[PDB]
Design a protein around this ligand. Structure first.
Ligand SMILES: *[C@@H]1O[C@H](CO)[C@@H](O[C@@H]2O[C@H](CO)[C@@H](O)[C@H](O)[C@H]2NC(C)=O)[C@H](O)[C@H]1NC(C)=O
Ligand SMILES: *[C@@H]1O[C@H](CO)[C@@H](O[C@@H]2O[C@H](CO)[C@@H](O)[C@H](O)[C@H]2NC(C)=O)[C@H](O)[C@H]1NC(C)=O
Ligand SMILES: Cc1nc2nc(C(=O)N3CCOCC3)cn2c(-c2ccc(Cl)cc2Cl)c1CN
Ligand SMILES: Cc1nc2nc(C(=O)N3CCOCC3)cn2c(-c2ccc(Cl)cc2Cl)c1CN
Ligand SMILES: CC(=O)N[C@@H]1[C@@H](O)[C@H](O)[C@@H](CO)O[C@H]1O
Ligand SMILES: *[C@@H]1O[C@H](CO)[C@@H](O)[C@H](O)[C@H]1NC(C)=O
Ligand SMILES: *[C@@H]1O[C@H](CO)[C@@H](O)[C@H](O)[C@H]1NC(C)=O
Ligand SMILES: *[C@@H]1O[C@H](CO)[C@@H](O)[C@H](O)[C@H]1NC(C)=O
Ligand SMILES: *[C@@H]1O[C@H](CO)[C@@H](O)[C@H](O)[C@H]1NC(C)=O
Ligand SMILES: *[C@@H]1O[C@H](CO)[C@@H](O)[C@H](O)[C@H]1NC(C)=O
Ligand SMILES: *[C@@H]1O[C@H](CO)[C@@H](O)[C@H](O)[C@H]1NC(C)=O
Ligand SMILES: *[C@@H]1O[C@H](CO)[C@@H](O)[C@H](O)[C@H]1NC(C)=O
Ligand SMILES: *[C@@H]1O[C@H](CO)[C@@H](O)[C@H](O)[C@H]1NC(C)=O
Ligand SMILES: *[C@H]1O[C@H](CO)[C@@H](O)[C@H](O)[C@H]1NC(C)=O
Lengths: 727, 727
């Protein structure tokens, strides 16, 4: 009988099915079946073909994605896709009028467009091209140029520079339509004095001289980009006169120094919320800005700013939390750490002091998902006190005490990890369960929270997997200093506590991470347990998220300490349990996991026989400012420079003589620079330690090209199989 | 009897002693002994300390080198040495007045000087600083400025650019003083439009942003630097009037296209010899340029031009050979490829056409070493018919049939490979024997070729080696289509022709190379044979040198052809021999040896279990123009594009599934760019071939930092051991 093989992982032999739909009103959504775009009625479940796979067979280009105007009249077609960073890319665009069932060829959207977006209502367009912003009121009409300052690598209007995209907004876009669709707000980033990271890109075999890539990127403590914020009135645009952008300056308490613009939320048609963060990320201000028709200006009264501080750590999980505004725009809710350091929903009324906690407990809210007049819907990990689970709840607005669990009980053995998607105005919602069993997609009505229908049960995949000897998963915890810390273990088929198993510790362990959860996954570890009979453990130690600040801020200004310690201690704990071959314990990790794997390998602990680090950080001065400084402060003598340097992998080289080490990195890694590994290897050479290495030419942090993806996991499997003495 | 261990190799436990001297006159030389500089009388062997080690115990800096003027009045002190390429570097210099016994302290040689030389006689100096040439008539006097055009990375006056240094002059200098010291000849190079190679340098851990290094480097087919030649009269220099340098123009037959200046020789006080070469290294012209005392000009009579062509390949082994002039400068001798294709000594008389061969035979003259009115001395491989041996011969210039071997019989057992060093006017000479026994340096008088005395017999080392199981070398040959091809074999001690030994083929096989010779070496192979009982073999197949053009030019316009195939056939032959285990045959090479190893691993032969390539070329369009075009012509559709394209390693990628491959490259290789290994690995990943890699951070082609050196050989040693299942 057969197992989950490496070739299965690499080749996607057992495919997970999903069901991504796109809401388009409070009761209809779109969906693709055989590349036909169907539109669905949510209430009754009937559907029909919105767009036929047939159309565009003679288009000329392969179509990459699409977006429909709110008013259903038009559709955007995205082709010539060219990926840049984690979120950004350039592409070409066409517009198809639906009622005319024709393709528009007037005033077309330029090739190399960097970003396009419909207005929330109607058929307006805004797009960035050559770092400048443009606006078409209508798709067959000439665009109005809004900005003139766009300049490659220096001035960005309406799109983000590298660090904002990666660490602040999590997106390339820096444009925000007012709900009216009347205003276009946007940010401008200035990278004039931001230093450049430089690396070689070799390209095709045919490229005689390797090309040098230069990217404005601030490493820890280096000069940051600066930011301006503007708002333009789209209703008032002249063919003759320029477009007048009104600026909104940051609070004076931000203007005194380096800061970031970290969130932008429209409250009403004439109220905006701005979140600002001090470069020292323990202080931030929310600014409420109202339009004044008499002047045309936007004013943010100092009086109604809201303010957040931390004395134990930084602000928010990764940034200040997002405000969810009540419909009238006079109050809002948002996740906040309470007096005991747990993140709960807090209620804020604009011109009033403080805020009011509507939730509390020894658990945390993960996200606020929806807000109607009678209810606030949110995900939390309360159920059964399992930080690694997720369920939908709703709280009765007029009686905070009445909290209903919407998902806890749908299928309590198959489903303990939910996410959700609401329709406009929240009349219907889609539930998505991700484990511990097979992913399961259902539809629901808000009225009586009635289960309308099952959308996808992955029955087909399930029939296949009954054939294979699949691994099982154990989610438990252990006690350390009177504190529970959770772990998981993917266990091989027919597990036997009277046998001894080799064990791989799969590490990430970065701040607010969680590696022990109830998600079902078909991945490299599935192969390792199913086929090679290795146990694959992970452990959430100090610094991990979703358990309260006491645990999360343990690591404050002290990266490469308690999280490293704890992974080691976790392994001592596992050896204690009697079914692990304490001669065959490995450790591996990627990104931040690579850094921790290295530090572990470098600790002299004597627990680990061998390990793999992929694209690991090696010293924090090498990584970016927003991320690094968030946790480490600045690397100056008067701040945290000491620990910046007590915490490098390099300084641990000698101890690598006791272990077998595999070090991997892509040459075109724009995120964690090849530098970081290049310095690790040199430190190891310089001290006479033998080790094994692999570079991947022209790959970035993902090393995700199909061929490279296959090569590295193959390479790594050999490594581990040697180390463990397996066939 | 212990064994020769890797450590012995890396720690240099068993050291070869040398005897490096510089002839100072017709009868004395200098010799550094315990940081004491000594003068030695050749005839009697008596000495006197010229400069005590005690001096400069108070200097302030570590002193890297020294240079005493021809008149012994001053000495240059080189310190603050920084290495650039293979020959180039910059440094600081102090001058010490040997008479006044003190350091001159004004009008100093600037810091970061790029080159200095004394004139041939006296105490003039010429130097290069910021790519401009300056001249001091006396060490305390201010220097006159010869050129003003010097510009970093663009215009070089009196020093060479990257290719010229590496591939033409085998030196940084481009300064040639007339024998008087009267004139200063120099070249100027213009790399205006020469593309730049760019790569990352990671420096010490403290550097936060890596540096991009940028070097004008013409790759096969790209724009080449241009050159001009000038001569300045050193006596008529003015304090206010800018010195005037007279330009010599290359011959019309050279100006029609791209060309090189390949050699400069002063013939008399008033006659310069210049050799030029076409970018297509088919054709070269030697110009003879006389000074016109009235004119002030220099004239190059077309009738005097001596032309070398080749229809079978290129001119010269690596470049047209150096001419050796008679005292009166009216005639010269030059190594030339004869009608049978063997390189022999040719006698040229200035105003007469063609020339006369002074020697002949099926062997070759390697070098002309000295010239008097009575004798011409040269090194050749005639003795015992071995191309891999070297001997000093003299030929009576009044009767060419009268050749006598000066070294053949001194010590037939111990010595078969000599180099030599003559005093001026060749009154005496130092013989240096390199094997096959321990190195042995002797002094001799020309009068009757008497042996004067022994300088170094390496008896120290001999003593030490009496306690180690040393391996032996067999130097034999095989037949291939009726032609003899040589190889050598390092044989483990106590070699039993009955057993079967694993075999490592050590390859270079570049054009005009030679890996089978009679020289003594303590190297990696010594360790492998002695300690790990491996037979290390090397073979000189087609393309190799010192055996006639039929063999050397076989590879014309088809690198990665016969030399790759011949390495393969050699291996087969070696199997036939009943003492090699044909299941355990590996291969490895560096540089060209790296490319060949790759072509071989990727050929499909099934002969080799595994191989190592170190800094390999993989594609000839990536290597430089002077070396590459010499053998491949230009990479254009009209010339040799097809074979450029056919002889990439990348095209053989699939075949690598059959072998184990380790690929190694320094990230800072200015010579064979990392690009080349980056493209090999990408081809291997693209087609799903697994392999081993290792990059060396900030190392260059030589990978020679003491720590990198030790680390690469250790890494390589594990791999080889593993391949052969060696305990
Ligand atoms: C982006 O920021 C740069 C850097 O500060 C600005 O450049 C400066 O502009 C002022 C006014 O022109 C000058 O006085 C400075 O000398 C400039 N410094 C540099 C480094 O150039 C630039 O104006 C900003 N660009 C925009 C459009 O906001
Ligand atoms: C080095 O070579 C470059 C290219 O041949 C020369 O550049 C030219 O400069 C002259 C003016 O002296 C003009 O003919 C052109 O404007 C330039 N062309 C280019 C491509 O830049 C340059 O003159 C040379 N420098 C020296 C010292 O000879
Ligand atoms: C936005 C972001 N997303 C991420 N996903 C992973 C991830 O799980 N891995 C692990 C699995 O494979 C992909 C990366 C890591 N990151 C990081 C990140 C965090 C720390 C460091 Cl040191 C580097 C990065 Cl990129 C960042 C922040 N830039
Ligand atoms: C001036 C020169 N000297 C060299 N010595 C070696 C050598 O023997 N090995 C011995 C083994 O160690 C490496 C160098 C190789 N080269 C080459 C050379 C030739 C071809 C290529 Cl592809 C690269 C180089 Cl550097 C060049 C000219 N570039
Ligand atoms: C009519 C008008 O103001 N249009 C201007 C144009 O003249 C100018 O080139 C640009 C940059 O200043 O801004 C816009
Ligand atoms: C669903 O059916 C209703 C009633 O026939 C119809 O009006 C509506 O257009 C249908 N919607 C879809 C998505 O087909
Ligand atoms: C996009 O570029 C291609 C040619 O590269 C062309 O077919 C098309 O017309 C361009 N689109 C626009 C908006 O100009
Ligand atoms: C939207 O709100 C703005 C702000 O007052 C107002 O000026 C505008 O008329 C509104 N737009 C539309 C199209 O209703
Ligand atoms: C437990 O406390 C000890 C100090 O007494 C400390 O060494 C260790 O890090 C702690 N462990 C955890 C995981 O809290
Ligand atoms: C100086 O010379 C003496 C021999 O005369 C030698 O013994 C001593 O080591 C030398 N000092 C050095 C090498 O600095
Ligand atoms: C060697 O000895 C002779 C005879 O005294 C002397 O003239 C000569 O200068 C000496 N040479 C050296 C280098 O000491
Ligand atoms: C060297 O030769 C040049 C040219 O013949 C002449 O001008 C000069 O006087 C000579 N130098 C000496 C010092 O003999
Ligand atoms: C000799 O002939 C063989 C036959 O296989 C051929 O492959 C090879 O190229 C030839 N070698 C020489 C030395 O010409
Ligand atoms: C060279 O600079 C060094 C210090 O870097 C200094 O001692 C000296 O004055 C300089 N020498 C000259 C003459 O340029």
């Amino acid at each position: 009988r057969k197992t989950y093989t490496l070739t299965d992982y690499l080749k996607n032999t057992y495919r997970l099915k999903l069901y991504s739909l796109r809401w388009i009103s409070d009761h209809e959504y779109l969906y693709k079946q055989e590349n036909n775009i169907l539109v669905f009625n949510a209430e009754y479940g009937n559907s029909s073909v919105f767009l036929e796979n047939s159309t565009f067979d003679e288009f000329g280009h392969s179509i990459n994605d699409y977006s429909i105007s709110p008013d259903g009249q038009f559709i955007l077609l995205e082709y010539n896709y060219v990926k840049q960073w984690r979120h950004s890319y350039t592409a070409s665009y066409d517009i198809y009028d639906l009622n005319k069932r024709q393709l528009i060829t007037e005033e077309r959207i330029p090739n190399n467009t960097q970003w396009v977006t419909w207005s929330p209502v109607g058929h307006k367009l805004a797009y960035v091209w050559n770092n400048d912003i443009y606006v078409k009121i209508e798709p067959n009409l000439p665009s109005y140029r809004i900005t003139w300052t766009g300049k490659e690598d220096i001035i960005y209007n309406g799109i983000t520079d590298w660090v904002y995209e990666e660490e602040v907004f999590s997106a390339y876009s820096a444009l925000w339509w007012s709900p009216n669709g009347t205003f276009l707000a946007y940010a401008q980033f200035n990278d004039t004095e931001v230093p450049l990271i430089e690396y070689s890109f070799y390209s095709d075999e045919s490229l005689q001289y390797p090309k040098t890539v230069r990217v404005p990127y601030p490493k820890a403590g280096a000069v940051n980009p600066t930011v301006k914020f503007f708002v333009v009135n789209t209703d008032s645009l002249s063919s003759v006169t320029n477009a007048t952008s009104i600026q909104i300056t940051a609070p004076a308490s931000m203007l005194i120094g380096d800061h970031y613009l970290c969130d932008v939320t429209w409250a009403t048609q004439e109220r905006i919320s701005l979140q600002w963060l001090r470069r020292i990320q323990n202080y931030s201000v929310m600014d409420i800005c109202d339009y004044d028709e008499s002047s045309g200006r936007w004013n943010c009264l100092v009086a109604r700013q809201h303010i957040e501080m931390s004395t134990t750590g930084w602000v928010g999980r990764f940034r200040p939390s997002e405000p969810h505004f009540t419909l009238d725009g006079n109050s809002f809710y948002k996740i906040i750490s309470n007096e005991e350091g747990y993140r709960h929903i807090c209620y804020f009324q604009i011109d009033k002091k403080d805020c009011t906690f509507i939730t509390k407990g020894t658990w945390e809210v993960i996200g606020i998902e929806a807000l109607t007049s009678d209810y606030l819907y949110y995900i939390s990990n309360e159920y059964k006190g399992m930080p690694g689970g997720r369920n939908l709840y709703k709280i009765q607005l007029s009686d905070y005490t009445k909290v209903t669990c919407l998902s806890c009980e749908l299928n309590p053995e198959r489903c303990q990890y939910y996410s959700v998607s609401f329709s406009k105005e929240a009349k219907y919602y889609q539930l998505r369960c991700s484990g511990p069993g097979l992913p399961l997609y259902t539809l629901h009505s808000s009225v009586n929270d009635k289960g309308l229908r099952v959308l996808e049960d992955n029955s087909a995949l399930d029939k296949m997997l009954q054939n294979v000897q699949m691994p099982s998963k154990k989610l438990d915890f252990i006690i350390l200093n009177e504190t529970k810390f959770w772990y998981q273990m993917i266990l091989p088929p027919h597990f036997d506590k009277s046998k001894k198993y080799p064990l791989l510790l799969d590490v990430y362990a970065g701040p607010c991470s969680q590696k022990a959860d109830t998600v079902f996954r078909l991945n490299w570890a599935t192969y390792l347990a199913s086929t090679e009979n290795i146990i694959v453990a992970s452990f959430d130690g100090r610094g991990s998220g979703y358990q309260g600040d006491k645990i999360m801020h343990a690591i404050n200004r002290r990266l490469g300490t308690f999280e490293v310690e704890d992974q080691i201690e976790a392994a001592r704990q596992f050896s204690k349990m009697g079914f692990v071959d304490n001669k065959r314990i490995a450790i591996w990790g990627w990104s931040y996991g690579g850094y921790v794997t290295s530090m572990v390998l470098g600790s002299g602990s004597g627990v680990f026989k061998c390990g793999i680090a992929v694209a690991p950080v090696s010293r924090w001065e090498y990584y970016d400012s927003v991320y690094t400084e968030r946790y480490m402060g600045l690397p100056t003598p008067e701040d945290n420079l000491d620990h910046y340097r007590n915490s490098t992998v390099m300084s641990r080289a000698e101890n690598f003589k006791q272990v077998e080490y595999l070090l991997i990195h892509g040459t075109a890694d724009d995120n964690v620079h090849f530098q970081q590994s290049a310095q690790i290897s040199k430190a190891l050479v310089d001290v006479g330690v033998d080790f094994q290495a692999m570079w991947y030419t022209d790959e970035d942090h993902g090393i995700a090209s199909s061929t490279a993806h296959q090569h590295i996991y193959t390479h790594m499997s050999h490594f581990i199989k040697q180390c463990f003495s397996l066939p």
